[PDB]
Amino acid sequence: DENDEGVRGTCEDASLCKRFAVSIGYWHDPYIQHFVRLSKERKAPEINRGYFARVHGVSQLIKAFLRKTECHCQIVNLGAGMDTTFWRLKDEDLLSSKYFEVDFPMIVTRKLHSIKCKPPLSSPILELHSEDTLQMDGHILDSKRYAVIGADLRDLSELEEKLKKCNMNTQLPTLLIAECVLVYMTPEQSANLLKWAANSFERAMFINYEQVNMGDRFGQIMIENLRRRQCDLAGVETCKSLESQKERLLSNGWETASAVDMMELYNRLPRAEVSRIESLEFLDEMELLEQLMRHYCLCWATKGGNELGLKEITY
């Protein structure tokens, strides 16, 4: 309980940072402006570059999954926050059969207000809906192609029930996304979640972006710093190394796993992309980026992906 307000506060942080990078042209998002204010104080170049690689990272894995399943699938964004992926997938003509989002009721309430208030958000959902009205009773928005569910991820009975209420199909291939979320719950709770995800789908994928190599002074200072913001990282013990991150996924029901630290990913970016970004802002101290990026990772696991060839997916 005591930590939940602080954890919920992090959604405002990531949203602010993502919009700011977008405003200065790191990537294209015409939808985030409807969810969060434009920060008037800059985020430092390494934060914006860092958020870029994170976004690019997950974006490339999502595209690959959709490609391999020919969009005949489900995507379940876990701890989605102010995620705009639904609308962006609809523009790119890469929409999955249904898009599911999950977060604390408090967060969902913020997101349902924005959706209901602003037609740029609600029309695209209705264009694809069976009804002329979006119905938002409780802390749930349900539609044909898009659902937003208010649930605690640490209570799996609540989670499963509501996804199935929103007619999630167990037999469809399914990509699940935990973009900086698992680290806010206990190691045992995030294991339960991963286990359940692996048990629910014969054909599935999991993207996990979070902290890594946290067993040093840098990681310790971060832990202490986030506690000033009343936000404890309940699952840091799982953020030991890339090896433990891959082992966390395999031990909890998945057949293959891969992980790269964010910097490794940064240096593996296409040169044309690097050139575009590095001409957006000037960063004189690359060692600051280096230190930050080595402490985060992008991991992905699959299971039952033989016929589809999900073993071959890369960022």
């Binding site: 992090t10 942080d13 990531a14 940072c17 008037k40 104080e41 800059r42 985020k43 430092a44 170049p45 934060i47 860092g50 958020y51 994170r54 900086c180 040093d216 002074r217 840098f218 310790q220 200072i221 971060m222 710093n225 986030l226 000033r228 913001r229 802002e281 000037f282 004189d284 101290e285 690359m286 060692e287 600051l288 230190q291 930050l292 985060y296």
Partner: protein, 303 residues
């Protein structure tokens, strides 16, 4: 008259010590008196030992207070600062105001040099502009300080033997007389001598080299040794680079780097150091961590 002004400045120093910023007009006056002082100062500031030498502070006010507890307070301790007073830390206003206030109050006891962050363009990006615009309601104060940075001396020389500057050496400079010949009263240029002094870095590479900073140059030990022997110097002292242990010898002790912002950006975990020089130029270092400031708010991560 200036009799009244000196009394008020004591009160300002008293105020800034408890991290309370000065009013808009107060800053305007302080910068003008500082301008009139700095104009009459050389590009190469000749300093007498004993002196305590400091590097990057970057708006980390409470850690500057930690610096003073350890090195002794001004003007009891003769001080020489090597720039980078602003940006990244959350208290650039208080930090840079106090250091300027100490200069105006004790001109003979404080040397403040220009760092690469004492620049218009850089402060617009790395936090200082944003801090002034928040702490005050407009850009006037940013304007007043940035206008002043143009007057900050580029370089200092301790007792004809120890050469102090923020960044490093330049291919456009062989002698100190090449330094005093420069026109420093301008915004830090993109290229050229004045630029390189504030931006350059030493490295393990032989000779000169392209800088990964994208401004100034990377110089090897052979450049340090030519410049020291050609100018009768024993040591080039500098800041500008993060060092994990607070200070770092390189180039067979021809160069030393001093970094005085502990736990840089409130993230890095580095020690900060300061270099004391005694009455006969013998050196020693004082390592220190940040002050325990409970109300300091979080730096950015990926959340």
């Amino acid at each position: 008259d200036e009799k009244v002004f000196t009394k008020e400045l004591d009160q300002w120093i008293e105020q800034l010590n408890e991290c309370k910023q000065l009013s808009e007009s107060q800053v305007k006056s302080l910068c003008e008196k500082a301008k009139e002082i700095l104009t009459k100062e050389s590009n190469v500031q000749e300093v007498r030992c004993p002196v305590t030498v400091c590097g990057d502070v970057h708006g980390q006010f409470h850690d500057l207070m930690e610096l003073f507890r350890i090195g002794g307070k001004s003007p009891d301790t003769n001080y020489l600062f090597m720039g980078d007073y602003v940006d990244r830390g959350y208290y650039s206003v208080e930090t840079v105001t106090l250091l300027v206030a100490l200069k105006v109050r004790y001109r003979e006891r404080i040397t403040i040099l220009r760092g690469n962050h004492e620049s218009r363009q850089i402060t617009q990006v790395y936090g200082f502009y944003d801090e002034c615009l928040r702490k005050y309601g407009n850009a006037n104060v940013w304007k007043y300080f940035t206008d002043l940075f143009d007057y900050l001396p580029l370089t200092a020389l301790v007792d004809g033997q120890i050469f102090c500057l923020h960044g490093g050496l330049s291919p456009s400079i062989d002698t100190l007389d090449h330094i005093r010949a420069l026109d420093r009263l301008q915004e830090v240029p993109h290229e050229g001598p004045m630029c390189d002094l504030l931006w350059s870095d030493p490295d393990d590479r032989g000779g000169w080299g392209i800088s990964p900073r994208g401004a100034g140059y990377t110089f090897g030990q052979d450049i340090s040794e030519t410049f020291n022997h050609a100018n009768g110097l024993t040591l080039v002292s500098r800041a500008h680079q993060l060092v994990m242990e607070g200070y770092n010898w390189c180039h067979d002790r021809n160069v030393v780097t001093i970094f005085s912002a502990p736990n840089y950006c409130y993230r890095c975990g580095n020690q900060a150091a300061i270099m004391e020089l005694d009455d006969t130029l013998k050196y020693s270092f004082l390592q220190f961590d940040p002050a325990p400031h409970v109300t300091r708010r979080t730096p950015d991560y990926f959340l």
